[PDB]
Amino acid sequence: SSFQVMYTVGYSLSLGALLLALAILGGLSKLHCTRNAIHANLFASFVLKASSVLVIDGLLRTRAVAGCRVAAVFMQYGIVANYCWLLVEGLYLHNLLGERSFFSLYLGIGWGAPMLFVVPWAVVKCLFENVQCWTSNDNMGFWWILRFPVFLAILINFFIFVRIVQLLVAKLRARQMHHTDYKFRLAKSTLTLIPLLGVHEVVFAFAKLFFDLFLSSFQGLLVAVLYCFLNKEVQSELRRRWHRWRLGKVLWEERESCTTASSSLAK
Amino acid sequence: TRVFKKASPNGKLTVYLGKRDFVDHIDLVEPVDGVVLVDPEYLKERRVYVTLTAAFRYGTFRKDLFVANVQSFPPAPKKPLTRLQERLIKKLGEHAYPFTFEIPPNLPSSVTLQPGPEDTGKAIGVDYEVKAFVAENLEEKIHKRNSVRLVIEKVQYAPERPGPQPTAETTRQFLMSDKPLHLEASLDKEIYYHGEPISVNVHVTNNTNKTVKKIKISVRQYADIVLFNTAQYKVPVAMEEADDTVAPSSTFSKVYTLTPFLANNREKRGLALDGKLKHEDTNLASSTLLREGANREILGIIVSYKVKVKLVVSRGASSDVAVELPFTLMHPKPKEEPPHREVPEH
Amino acid sequence: SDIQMTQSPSSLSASVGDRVTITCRASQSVSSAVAWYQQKPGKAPKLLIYSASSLYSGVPSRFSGSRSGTDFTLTISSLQPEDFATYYCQQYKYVPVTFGQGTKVEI
Amino acid sequence: VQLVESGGGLVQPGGSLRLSCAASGFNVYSSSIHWVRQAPGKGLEWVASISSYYGYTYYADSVKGRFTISADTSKNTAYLQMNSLRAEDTAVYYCARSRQFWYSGLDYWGQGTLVTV
Amino acid sequence: QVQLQESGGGLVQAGGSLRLSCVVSGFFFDTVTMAWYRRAPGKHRELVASATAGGTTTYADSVKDRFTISRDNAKNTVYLQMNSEDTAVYYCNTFVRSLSWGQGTQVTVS
């Protein structure tokens, strides 16, 4: 039924769209841009979470204690890092509207401290509650030790979100960056990702269950299109490459006369 | 005191041109002069048309940029005669009908792209052509045997007043902060004559922990070839490298000599070369001047030359810091006339 | 086919101030690639006129060259006392780069 | 603007002699170097020419293939490696200079080296 | 390649006659306007006598009532005769000066 074919389809195009974004954002004229240094790492967190999801489903279909050992550990870390690096982007807009020491701090929020709070969950497996592989349907004794960072990150994300709307409205009220191509473009995509993803997790935490399965599946595609496909700067670069390729082909496809003499002039 | 002729295949038409090249200024273009001779008992059509057209050859087809219509009919409905034009009329007689042209300013120069190893025959590039034919009406077809096809080239020369010397500075820091990597370079002059050496002075100091690998020096020629859509091209006409390394907390200063020439660039497809009459070889088509704030919608090849210096670091995976210095390379002002062929003919 | 150029005057004697004419007949047809060189006894040659109509920088204005068809000629208005030399013709329109037979001038 | 050369030494049939011509004040890529041979008492004669910009080498019919001419950029010098000289080669060699672009004849000439075989 | 084979001319006395001939190979005479160019003891070749296929014996103002011209397409040649300062070398080309020039022959009027 739709519980399986649709479930694997939703993640099927997530990696394809995200990996295509990685190829585009990997090497171009803006490979070292600070703006793209955050989006590229955000896609990696989505790829890491999505990759661990697909292998878990395949292993269950085939059926191994050791087989799921590699898959599940990054799955729980990826979803936590997904929200942790989501706060990184939110603070980036606040710093932009308010590199250097920020880059070190931003890395610690996304790929730093959350790794320190995900290890204790993975550490206590042989000590207590091994229950073969993880199922996440047992008693809540081991719960809320990994759900705290994502709940905390959502709460802080709203604090910046409330601040950012008032700052932009006040600034745009009297000239300033009313229709700029740099601050507005980042804020337009930020204004949708933080609330919609934030309210999805908290509301469903406390046929409804089936309706929330593909919502997370499209999160990777939704982020990629709003950050890479919708971005105007890359489209100009993409059009330049497309025009150059088209022009190069056109100039190099494979598919009586009397000699000029001379005469003496009166002077 | 010499003119150029091109007889018609039937021998009933010939167009006299004083010079085969015309100087293009910032906003002024030298007018095209000359006369056309038609023998009696042949002007029954009562219409002589001399047309100057510029077309972009690609692949093949001709994309006409600008087309001029001048009629040399015996009625000839002011156009004061130039001294060169008047001299031709007196020698030939009263049967010569003078014609004149007024090329609009801000037009692409005669530049032809260099063919690659896989030759395609006709050379792709912007070419100016002057043709004369006789027919009853304009819509009537014109045969090659009953017309002439004289090719002319529009060229530009370096201004008499050199501009300021190029100079630029850049600084890049990666994830370590403080102790900036200073890098700056300069050129002796903005305008360089053809064949003259290009000397660049580079001053690099590296106070950071990361070392500096070999320095890359290259000269890049940009061809803004647009006929349907804009597409900038990059060609390293000159390239030389040195294995000099910059130690941490040290200052480096050296001068590198560069020379752009096509002796080793004959195998580089896509290079832009000056106007070719029939098969002669030109020399690294010069840059095209622009009238300051002019529109960039010119449908043609625009040539610009720049110098790029690249330094790669070892990162303790390698990153490069590059600053580009534009420069001008044009021919000087000819005294008598430009020889539009190889002077030593074998 | 090779091109051979002959200089009709081989040697002549003249005083100071007379009008001396030196002609040079060419076998083939050369548009303007004609140059004349001066040579003192035991001295390096020096260019006098290029393109058969132009004048080189630093050369005295008394020298003048004219072209009428194919017999390029060089004319000197006043023969200065130190102007004696041997004049050599040249062509640079073809590969051979053929020189003239020379015209020795003495006072 | 000044060209200096030595080209000294007795020459025997079936031998070789390398001529070094130093060029100062100008480069090679914008100035084609020509060598002119003048027999003692006879007229001038052109033997070889080098165009480094276009990479073209030209030779006289009588000396085709016998001589070797090359130029260098580091020191801006023109070399004329002649091999297997015949009896009819006693003359004076001049290192003429011209313009690579807008050719206007040989304006600068070398001092002249006497070669006797 | 066009062979401008012209013959005729030499030592001529005052009031005499000197027939001139010219044979052109590799070209058609159906519709061409001959011009019969003549040089001067100096330079600056001028026009003397122009004649098309049918009539139209256009003559230079200095040679009226002294020269005669004729043309024959069948033999593929052009003929010029003179009766009675005119000493110069004669050339032969069309009115448009399309064919290549030749050395020609020179006549002397004594």
Numbering used by the authors:
A (entry chain R): 139 to 201, 220 to 254, 260 to 367, 380 to 428, 1356 to 1367
B (entry chain A): 6 to 64, 74 to 91, 94 to 332, 339 to 368
C (entry chain L): 1 to 107
D (entry chain H): 5 to 121
E (entry chain B): 1 to 84, 88 to 113
Authors' description from the paper:
Arrestins have pivotal roles in regulating G protein-coupled receptor (GPCR) signalling by desensitizing G protein activation and mediating receptor internalization. Here we report two structures of the glucagon receptor (GCGR) bound to β-arrestin 1 (βarr1) in glucagon-bound and ligand-free states. In our GCGR(V2RC)–βarr1 structures, the receptor interacts with βarr1 mainly through its C-terminal region, including helix VIII and the V2R tail, whereas the receptor intracellular pocket remains unoccupied. The tail-binding pose is further defined by a close proximity between the βarr1 C-edge and the receptor helical bundle, and stabilized by a phosphoinositide derivative that bridges βarr1 with helices I and VIII of GCGR.
To facilitate complex formation, the C-terminal region of GCGR (residues H433–F477) was exchanged for the C-terminal residues A343–S371 of the vasopressin type 2 receptor (V2R) (termed GCGR(V2RC)). Aiming to improve complex stability, a cysteine-free βarr1 was generated by introducing seven mutations and its C-terminal region (residues I377–R418) was replaced with the antibody scFv30. The protein sample was then subjected to cryo-electron microscopy (cryo-EM) single-particle analysis, yielding two maps of the complex in glucagon-bound and ligand-free states at resolutions of 3.3 Å and 3.5 Å, respectively. The maps allowed unambiguous modelling of the majority of the residues in the receptor transmembrane domain and βarr1. Except for the distinct ligand-binding states, the two structures are similar with a root-mean-squared deviation (r.m.s.d.) of 1.4 Å for all atoms. Unexpectedly, in the GCGR(V2RC)–βarr1 complexes, helix VIII of the receptor has a major role in defining the tail-binding pose of βarr1. The cryo-EM maps display the densities for the phospholipid dioctyl-phosphatidylinsitol-4,5-bisphosphate (diC8-PtdIns(4,5)P2), which was added during protein purification. It bridges the C-lobe of βarr1 with the intracellular tip of helix I, ICL1 and helix VIII of GCGR, acting as a ‘trestle’ to further stabilize the tail conformation of the complex. Consistent with the inactive conformation of the receptor, the agonist glucagon is either absent or loosely attached to the receptor in the βarr1-bound GCGR structures.
